[PDB]
Amino acid sequence: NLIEVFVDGQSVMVEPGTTVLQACEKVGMQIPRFCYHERLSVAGNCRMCLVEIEKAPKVVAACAMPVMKGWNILTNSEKSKKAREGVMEFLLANHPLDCPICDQGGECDLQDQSMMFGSDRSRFLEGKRAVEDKNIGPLVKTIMTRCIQCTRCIRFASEIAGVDDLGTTGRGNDMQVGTYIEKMFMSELSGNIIDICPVGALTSKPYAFTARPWETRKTESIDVMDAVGSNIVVSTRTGEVMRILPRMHEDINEEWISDKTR
Amino acid sequence: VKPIFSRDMNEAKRRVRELYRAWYREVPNTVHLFQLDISVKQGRDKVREMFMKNAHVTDPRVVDLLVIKGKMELEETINVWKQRTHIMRFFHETEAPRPTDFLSKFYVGHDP
Amino acid sequence: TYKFVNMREPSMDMKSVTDRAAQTLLWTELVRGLGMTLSYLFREPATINYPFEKGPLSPRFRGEHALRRYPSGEERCIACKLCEAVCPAQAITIEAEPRADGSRRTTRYDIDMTKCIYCGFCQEACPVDAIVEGPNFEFSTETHEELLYNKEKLLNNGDKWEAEIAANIQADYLYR
Amino acid sequence: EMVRKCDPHIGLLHRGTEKLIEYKTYLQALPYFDRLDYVSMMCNEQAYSLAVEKLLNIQPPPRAQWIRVLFGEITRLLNHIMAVTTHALDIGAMTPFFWMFEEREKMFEFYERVSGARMHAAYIRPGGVHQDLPLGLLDDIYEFSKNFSFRIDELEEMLTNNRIWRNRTVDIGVVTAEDALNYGFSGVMLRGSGIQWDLRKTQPYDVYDQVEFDVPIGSRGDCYDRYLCRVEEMRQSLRIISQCLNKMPPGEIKVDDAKVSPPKRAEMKTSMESLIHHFKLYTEGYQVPPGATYTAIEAPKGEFGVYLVSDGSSRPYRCKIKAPGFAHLAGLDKMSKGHMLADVVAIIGTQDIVFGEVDR
Amino acid sequence: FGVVFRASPRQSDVMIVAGTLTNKMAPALRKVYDQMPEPRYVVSMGSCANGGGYYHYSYSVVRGCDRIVPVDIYVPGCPPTAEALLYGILQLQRKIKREKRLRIWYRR
Amino acid sequence: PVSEVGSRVISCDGGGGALGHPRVYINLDKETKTGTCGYCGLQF
Amino acid sequence: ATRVIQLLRNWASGRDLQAKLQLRYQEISKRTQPPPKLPVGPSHKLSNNYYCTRDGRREAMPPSIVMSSQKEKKAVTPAPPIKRWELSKDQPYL
Amino acid sequence: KLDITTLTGVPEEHIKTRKVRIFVPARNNMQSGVNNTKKWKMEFDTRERWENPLMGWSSTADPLSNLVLTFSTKEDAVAFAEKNGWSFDVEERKVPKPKSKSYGANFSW
Amino acid sequence: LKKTTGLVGLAVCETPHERLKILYTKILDVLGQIPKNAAYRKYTEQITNEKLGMVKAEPDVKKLEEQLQGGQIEEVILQAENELSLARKMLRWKPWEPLVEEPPANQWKWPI
Amino acid sequence: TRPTIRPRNDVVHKQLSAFGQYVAEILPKYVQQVQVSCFNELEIFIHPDGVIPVLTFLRDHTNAQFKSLADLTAVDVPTRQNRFEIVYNLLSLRFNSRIRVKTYTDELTPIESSVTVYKAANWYEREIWDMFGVFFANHPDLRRILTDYGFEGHPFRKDFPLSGYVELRYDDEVKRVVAEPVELAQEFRKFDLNSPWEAFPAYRQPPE
Ligand SMILES: CCCCCCCCCCCCCCCCC[C@@H](O)O[C@H](CO[C@H](O)CCCCCCCCCCCCCCC)COP(=O)(O)OCC[N+](C)(C)C
Ligand code: SF4
Ligand code: SF4
Ligand code: SF4
Ligand code: SF4
Ligand code: SF4
Ligand code: FES
């Protein structure tokens, strides 16, 4: 008992329910994304995942609607593409010109999404908002301003670290994912957000500035700080270790890593 | 399946022996014409050694292919192609010694 | 379209025959070319008097590198490090570490003219327009180790020439 | 004192290019091409930028095409000057050399002026062309071009009639018009044996549709005819310059597609997408659709040929480079048997070969 | 400046090494260098053979020109402008002018 | 060197119109501010 | 640069160089130039652009294929034959 | 067992005392992308790399550290190295398990 | 007659027509052994007989080469000469099978 | 969709298509498939044994008077049952157009040389021989070019380090230049530019 569904053309005997996103993931075609993340939770913000139904006139978020009843879905449909350009211009309407200095610069997902889909000409012609920093702890280097409110990190905190100290604040523009009140946020999974953070809005202070992503070689191995034995990708800029990242593995770390080890 | 040259081993081994005859006899001429000051024996021995280097190859076509790559070199020394440098190259004489003993290697460097 | 070079052939007319024969015996075209080089003896020589005079160049011309400062006196370079990432010879090597103030900076920007090909990709690449391919074109030197410029060396080159470079960029940037 | 067989051994300058190209992204591979047929530095770049634009399915704004042809032609003159000249120097004429390299230097004043380098001007881009050329240039090219013809003409007075020069090169080294084709001779080495073929007229790639010029066919196939082809093609290029000067439209020069052409500096410094595409164009570089092709254009020595295969990544997978000289030099020993040892020297020169291109 | 290109090392002294070097080529280079009369010099030129330059990483290049001959002055460029070369050789003369075997020979 | 006055958000470019660092918006008044590369702080 | 010489020079030449004197540039283009302003470009309109259209690289398509033999009738040319060229018109011979 | 060791000019040291390490590369975790993840590649083991006494460059001895090769299938890769007579460390493709997702499960109570 | 010949290797040949008749006749004859199977005999005869029909149709040469649609028929006679040895090869290659072999499908799948 | 994108003529695509069909029928003992690259480049395949007969006819008239090899390229690919993948460009003059036949080859199977068929291919046999392992049968003289003398291992093998395994240097104690393992300084820094997110939906293979 599992429904047939058509990715753009070919039939696919997809699992019952399950999000359109997961359907195309099953055919392997990859929808542009931000706020969604498996091993986290679904959310309707950041509508960069919009896709066009075979017949229904308006696009729907890919990670929202479960597939059913022989649906067909044209990921490559032109209206979908105009939708994606539509959103991307909005995201780039305020993200600060920081690519050369932002430490996320080598592989920030926002860049690549801007390349693959976003219209190249700017046509915003006013003034970006920009906001003061919110100091948070020995580790994470919050910068904000580069923030795009994929709430993501809070969905990280409330649903895995379990701490709910940080959260969204305010409405419209000026709404901020920074925690109100100066209080420092320390937790044992505080390090992994530096991985989880979509852009450069949150990046590790200790590693900061030290290196650039296209440079470092990326050896695979396992942690030793714990006997837990989680898989990792150590990253070295030639003859010297630069930074550690988790390597996903279902039996153990699954995309996460500790913090003392990091 | 198309063979390069000789079918089955042994038919190719004779080729290589022929090749040894050619090299061996040519060698003193090599030392003479090139003004090499290697001991006239040494080149011969080294030839025999190079012949020992692949003295365990066992594939059909690969060995005849080996004598193809073996022809070109005597082909070059006979035409005075290559030079004193190029032909003296085989003796690795400038290299610093590298004992294969575990402990010896062990003191020297990080090793594999 | 297509044209026949040669293919044209001599007339057998006796006046023409005697002309070619007299040409052979009396070397007309020979003395013609000889008269031609005579003619080039009398033209004014083209040589410039280098060093004392120096050849024409262009605002766009490429030469010695030199990182350069803000008018404020602060250095421009911010270690976006893509100068390393776009140089085909990969001459550049950079190793940034944070300022005590917390601003991004290089620790050992360096470059080696031994491998640099003076293509001017670095000149294009810098977002803050820090490194610049300077107008100077002469710095031939005795020893190989001098070629391998350190960061401080580049800054000193940026100090030596700054009015000059700023002049070229001033004269050029609109075309960029 | 007769040769019995010349036995060329190339690879004495095999710098090893194609292996290197594979490791570097498209935009970073471009300079290698100047480093190829270095006497004819622009046409190589043009060959490449065509080779990518077909894969990339993208068309330069017309003005760019007019530059691309224009400097394609000034370079046409460079290689022909160098060819006829040094071929003369090989047989001891000595003088014409110095009379011409003055001019050739005045041409490098132009590469100097627009590109900022005297030569090896990495200026042609896969997207079209780099910086726009300075306002003060075209009249300057005009003023030169009007007066060049006297120079080429005076050269011709020292050579074409100079019957000593005739006798040295007039019965050598003829190649059968079909036999050329079997060896795949290209450019002038074909036309010397009288076959009509020529890529600019045949399979035009740019505004050659819109220029008019007379290709000069040879006849006997002797070095002499090839020489006259060199000269006449110089004059014809000198015809092309006129037309390009007279129809040189205003407009942009890089392609609009920022995904391939980096944003202008005034813009990248003040809008986000601009800066991002800038950044990625220089970091990762542009991707190309996976595919394979063979472009070829009328480089002065012969057709220049690029076979390349995008894997889809930003680093091209394989980029075999046809070198017209390679075939010629292959055909040489057939062309030169039994000839006197000086004549093989002249005949190397009629082959107008450049070993940097042969060894690739 | 008096300098004149004359072929055949035996009638020449200073040696320019323009352009990229390669493996097969190198031994000939060492030959030619050896056959020059004292007081021979050489001049590495361009980013060419100062150290492979553009082609620094290939199997056939021999990195610097330095690794087969004892170079004098370097003239960085790619190509160096001919004038920068000219400054090169003039600098070479301003290095010969500091030569003083006679002063030293008497001293020893 | 001395910080420019502000109230509050304002541009920076390092003063070089298409010659300075790419335009950014510092966002402080009475607080010390910024910055990109230009030290042009807005403590006032 | 004197009449005593230039006449003899031209006569030795048979070309009269004085009309050109191309072997030097006495007074060419002035070096300093007025600012460029420079052209905008075709797609810079803000009112209507969509990269989904203007894109070229996305128009790349897998090669058309025929036979795939792996998985009357009439004869025909790859292309119509090209005509023989007209001969140069203005200067038929050289 | 089509050994071709004699044909390749490779010194014995590097067909012997080192090993290939076939695997399908892990996603960079900073990325949310998946493209580069797929397709086998054939990385070799690291060896020594010290430092230049001058300028501090990472001078290096090993002939072939940077080499890396894509593949379409693992069996092809193993067989590949076998043709070369190479020591190897084949590793499993580790595709993530499919997971259930529900926006409304967030609103159970 | 025809002065010159154009192509340097090309040699002027007066009264082509006879030689032409020997051409097409040698053509049809040497291909006359082709089993009707392969379509080669079909097409090649198709054009051959058409061209030859023009041969009989066009005793004059000056418009004849305006009729064969090929510059200098004097060359294309040698083109046909190439087709003669072509046919000499056609049956050494034998009448055509519906494909020998097929390459493994794992290959020929670009990109990679 | 005009100013930037190339127009791509339908006509040529037609003629090449039909002509591909034309040859496909004339001699189908070996034409595996006659794919037309959409930017007007025909290119039939060949069983490796079948090289001479095809190319032979490829000079021989029907329309295939494609005289002159433009080149003899040898693309490599580590996968596949046979890695090396040879390619032949060709040009016809009177109908001014280019095609591109190509084959495949084992590391060890000796495919025949094609020098006789295209005439100007003598140099290429030597090239590919010294840039690869592949051997051409009935070739008068394969031998090294574009290398040093000894040198041994073929480059362009898609593996095989660009820095190679050797270096020359002059050594005064023996007064001679000599080979020696690379000892390379600075090390070839190796960027990994390649990035996630497939750019090309129009291609992209089935996940399988
Ligand atoms: C009462 C009657 C008595 C006699 C009256 C008639 C006089 C007899 C005719 C006078 C002829 C004497 C001239 C000397 C012999 C000339 C033949 C020479 O030129 O041979 C040619 C070879 O030519 C010579 O080698 C020319 C090369 C000499 C290079 C030096 C140039 C000299 C510059 C002029 C100096 C003049 C100073 C003295 C003037 C007073 C070979 O001819 P060919 O093989 O068929 O084809 C080449 C034709 N050329 C001439 C165009 C080259
Ligand atoms: S990280 Fe934030 S700032 Fe740096 S480039 Fe990607 S988006 Fe622009
Ligand atoms: S915190 Fe990380 S995730 Fe939450 S908004 Fe700022 S950037 Fe997006
Ligand atoms: S671009 Fe100029 S400034 Fe920015 S990092 Fe590279 S070098 Fe330093
Ligand atoms: S000079 Fe040209 S090559 Fe050398 S680094 Fe700057 S850009 Fe790259
Ligand atoms: S310097 Fe420029 S030109 Fe001379 S070799 Fe090195 S790269 Fe080629
Ligand atoms: S993930 Fe679908 S809306 Fe952001």
TrEMBL record, chain A:
Binding sites annotated in the UniProt record for Mg(2+) 9: C197, V199
Residues that, per the record, bind [4Fe-4S] cluster 3: C147, C150, C153, C197
Binding residue positions for Mg(2+) 5: I194
GO annotation, cellular component aspect: mitochondrial inner membrane; respiratory chain complex I
Annotated binding of [4Fe-4S] cluster 2, by residue: H95, C99, C102, C108
List of residues binding Mg(2+) 3: Q104, V199
Positions contributing to Mg(2+) 6 binding: I194, C197
Binding locations of [2Fe-2S] cluster 1: F34, C35, Y36, C46, R47, C49, C63
Location (main, coarse): mitochondrion
Binding-site list for Mg(2+) 2: Q104, I194, C197
Keywords: 2Fe-2S, 4Fe-4S, Acetylation, Electron transport, Iron, Iron-sulfur, Membrane, Metal-binding, Mitochondrion, Mitochondrion inner membrane, NAD, Oxidoreductase, Respiratory chain, Transit peptide, Translocase, Transport, Ubiquinone
Binding site for [4Fe-4S] cluster 4: I148
Binding locations of Mg(2+) 1: Q104
Any one GO molecular-function label of the UniProt entry: NADH dehydrogenase (ubiquinone) activity
Binding annotation for [2Fe-2S] cluster 3: C35, C46, C63
Chain positions recorded as [4Fe-4S] cluster 1 binding sites: H95
Residues annotated as binding Mg(2+) 8: I194, L202
Chain positions recorded as Mg(2+) 4 binding sites: Q104, V199, L202
Subcellular location: Mitochondrion inner membrane
Binding-site residues for [2Fe-2S] cluster 2, renumbered to this chain: C35, Y36, N45, C46
Binding-site residues for Mg(2+) 10, renumbered to this chain: V199
GO terms, biological process: ATP synthesis coupled electron transport; mitochondrial respiratory chain complex I assembly
Function: Core subunit of the mitochondrial membrane respiratory chain NADH dehydrogenase (Complex I) which catalyzes electron transfer from NADH through the respiratory chain, using ubiquinone as an electron acceptor. Essential for catalysing the entry and efficient transfer of electrons within complex I. Plays a key role in the assembly and stability of complex I and participates in the association of complex I with ubiquinol-cytochrome reductase complex (Complex III) to form supercomplexes.
Family: Belongs to the complex I 75 kDa subunit family.
Organism: Sus scrofa
Automatic annotation (TrEMBL), chain D:
Binding site residues for [4Fe-4S] cluster 2: H120
Binding-site residues, [4Fe-4S] cluster 1: R35, H120
CC cofactor: [4Fe-4S] cluster
Cellular-component GO terms for this entry: mitochondrial inner membrane; respiratory chain complex I
Modified residues (Symmetric dimethylarginine): R15
One annotated GO biological process: gliogenesis
Protein name: NADH dehydrogenase [ubiquinone] iron-sulfur protein 2, mitochondrial
Automatic annotation (TrEMBL), chain E:
Superkingdom classification of source: Eukaryota
Essential cofactor(s): [4Fe-4S] cluster
Transmembrane segments: none
Keywords linked to the UniProt accession: 4Fe-4S, Iron, Iron-sulfur, Metal-binding, NAD, Nucleotide-binding
Catalyzed chemical reaction(s): a ubiquinone + NADH + 5 H(+)(in) = a ubiquinol + NAD(+) + 4 H(+)(out)
Residues the entry annotates as binding [4Fe-4S] cluster: C48, C78
Residue numbers binding NADPH: R108
GO terms of molecular function: 4 iron, 4 sulfur cluster binding; metal ion binding; NADH dehydrogenase (ubiquinone) activity; quinone binding
Function according to Swiss-Prot or TrEMBL: Core subunit of the mitochondrial membrane respiratory chain NADH dehydrogenase (Complex I) which catalyzes electron transfer from NADH through the respiratory chain, using ubiquinone as an electron acceptor. Essential for the catalytic activity of complex I.
Subunit structure: Core subunit of respiratory chain NADH dehydrogenase (Complex I) which is composed of 45 different subunits. This is a component of the iron-sulfur (IP) fragment of the enzyme.
Similarity comment: family membership: Belongs to the complex I 20 kDa subunit family.
The protein, known as: NADH dehydrogenase [ubiquinone] iron-sulfur protein 7, mitochondrial
Species per Swiss-Prot/TrEMBL record: Sus scrofa (Pig)
Lineage: Eukaryota, Metazoa, Chordata, Craniata, Vertebrata
Gene that this sequence comes from: NDUFS7
UniProtKB/TrEMBL annotation, chain H:
Keywords: Electron transport, Membrane, Mitochondrion, Mitochondrion inner membrane, Respiratory chain, Transit peptide, Transport
Region feature Disordered, mapped onto this chain: 93-109
Main localization (coarse): mitochondrion
Biological process terms in GO annotation: electron transport chain
Gene Ontology CC terms, in alphabetical order: mitochondrial inner membrane
Subcellular compartments: Mitochondrion inner membrane
Membrane topology of this protein: Peripheral membrane protein
Quaternary organization: This is a component of the iron-sulfur (IP) fragment of the enzyme.
Role noted for this protein: Accessory subunit of the mitochondrial membrane respiratory chain NADH dehydrogenase (Complex I), that is believed not to be involved in catalysis. Complex I functions in the transfer of electrons from NADH to the respiratory chain. The immediate electron acceptor for the enzyme is believed to be ubiquinone.
Family stated for the protein in its record: Belongs to the complex I NDUFS4 subunit family.
Protein name: NADH dehydrogenase [ubiquinone] iron-sulfur protein 4, mitochondrial
